[PDB]
Amino acid sequence: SLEGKTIGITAIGTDHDWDLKAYQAQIAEIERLGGTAIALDAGRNDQTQVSQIQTLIAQKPDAIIEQLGNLDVLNPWLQKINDAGIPLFTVDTATPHAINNTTSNNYSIGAELALQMVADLGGKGNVLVFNGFYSVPVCKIRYDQMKYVLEAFPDVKIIEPELRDVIPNTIQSAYSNVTDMLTKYPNEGDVGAIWACWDVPMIGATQALQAAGRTDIRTYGVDGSPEFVEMVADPESPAGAVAAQQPSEIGKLAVQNVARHLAGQEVKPFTFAPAVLITKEN
């Protein structure tokens, strides 16, 4: 099925749980179908990824799977994969350069999470927003849907400015930012929710609110990282909801889009894995 084939994987990291799950699932599926995997990990360095792409181009695999990262940086190099005549597949990276993008429904996810947040707020209150990854396609969608939904609720507002969630030291940088913002806004109704396009900073934000003794603010994020899920399920914790994805499914499905294409078969422009919203009572 991939028996005489070599598939390159280029991911920007395996630093955290979702990324590691997706990356491992790709490798496992390539080998399962009888293929050879050339697995490259950029260690959250963009310039590393660039040269890792160069490597893959020069190694001439039967196809390349690209995972996450900044689109604007990648674009000319993605173009050169097309120039080399190598089939390109992505996980999460929504680009015209790809035959297929395997991912989740970030449009529904983005909306439902935002809707849950305003439901929990009861249609009124202010929202602290971490928006440091907007150049990543899925976070662009997740942010856009949140902001669109909030247009309908004039008493639900995003506080200025938006904070920048970062890699590395994500959790502590978020914890420190939230602490700053609780100092700036101490009163019992000034801030009511905290949002990010992913789980990991919300782990920190929750820890900070807990340490501040604030039971009145809830946090919201996306991925379903075991630490944030457990916080959502805990009734003592201010973690409010999480969009739980299936990275292991996403990685698996991307490889069979590759395997389908190489067997001369029709592949759809995208493939969604399912995701659920998980809230405190649900």
Side-chain angles (χ1 to χ4, degrees):
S1 186
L2 248 23
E3 74 125 45
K5 320 274 169 165
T6 311
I7 314 301
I9 300 156
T10 169
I12 198 165
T14 71
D15 200 60
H16 62 100
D17 191 62
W18 191 102
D19 287 21
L20 178 65
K21 255 72 152 290
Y23 188 80
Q24 227 106 92
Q26 282 162 82
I27 295 168
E29 200 56 21
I30 290 160
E31 295 178 359
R32 187 185 85 77
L33 298 171
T36 301
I38 299 173
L40 302 165
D41 167 6
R44 288 281 161 187
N45 184 258
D46 286 289
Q47 238 66 248
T48 301
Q49 177 147 51
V50 171
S51 68
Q52 273 166 349
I53 289 165
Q54 293 174 337
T55 302
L56 286 174
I57 293 169
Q59 278 170 149
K60 296 165 180 62
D62 303 80
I64 291 167
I65 317 178
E66 202 288 325
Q67 172 175 321
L68 286 153
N70 274 217
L71 221 219
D72 59 332
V73 189
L74 264 18
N75 274 321
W77 297 102
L78 297 177
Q79 178 69 75
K80 278 153 191 151
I81 302 159
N82 300 154
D83 293 357
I86 303 159
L88 179 54
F89 291 85
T90 55
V91 348
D92 280 11
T93 312
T95 186
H97 293 290
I99 287 153
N100 170 276
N101 179 48
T102 303
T103 184
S104 292
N105 191 345
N106 286 288
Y107 301 92
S108 299
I109 280 161
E112 284 170 49
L113 187 74
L115 284 157
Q116 189 62 56
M117 190 178 330
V118 52
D120 290 349
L121 280 166
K124 204 265 173 69
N126 307 312
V127 172
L128 191 58
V129 169
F130 284 78
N131 192 25
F133 286 98
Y134 196 77
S135 56
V136 184
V138 304
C139 281
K140 196 259 190 77
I141 300 162
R142 284 157 197 172
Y143 179 82
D144 283 344
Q145 297 288 85
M146 184 268 322
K147 191 120 100 72
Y148 184 64
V149 159
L150 258 64
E151 291 171 19
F153 300 90
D155 277 344
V156 182
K157 277 167 281 191
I158 292 166
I159 27 207
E160 313 290 328
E162 285 154 27
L163 297 183
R164 253 86 213 120
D165 48 320
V166 299
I167 289 171
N169 305 118
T170 309
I171 294 184
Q172 49 207 135
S173 169
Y175 185 121
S176 306
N177 287 321
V178 173
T179 312
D180 290 355
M181 223 51 56
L182 289 161
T183 288
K184 195 189 259 82
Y185 308 110
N187 315 289
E188 269 68 70
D190 294 349
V191 46
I194 309 183
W195 182 91
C197 70
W198 66 310
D199 254 340
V200 178
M202 294 303 93
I203 294 156
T206 311
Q207 281 165 182
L209 291 173
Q210 209 130 214
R214 305 279 225 110
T215 51
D216 57 293
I217 302 167
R218 295 287 185 257
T219 66
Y220 301 86
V222 168
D223 273 359
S225 78
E227 11 180 3
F228 198 73
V229 172
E230 211 186 346
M231 280 167 161
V232 163
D234 175 34
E236 315 284 344
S237 163
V242 62
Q245 297 185 92
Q246 300 156 28
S248 288
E249 267 294 310
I250 279 143
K252 218 197 205 234
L253 285 161
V255 177
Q256 23 218 232
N257 279 320
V258 180
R260 219 186 197 276
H261 173 80
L262 292 171
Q265 290 176 24
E266 280 281 47
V267 175
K268 291 290 155 65
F270 58 91
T271 310
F272 295 149
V276 208
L277 189 77
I278 301 176
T279 76
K280 293 214 88 65
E281 47 173 48
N282 166 61

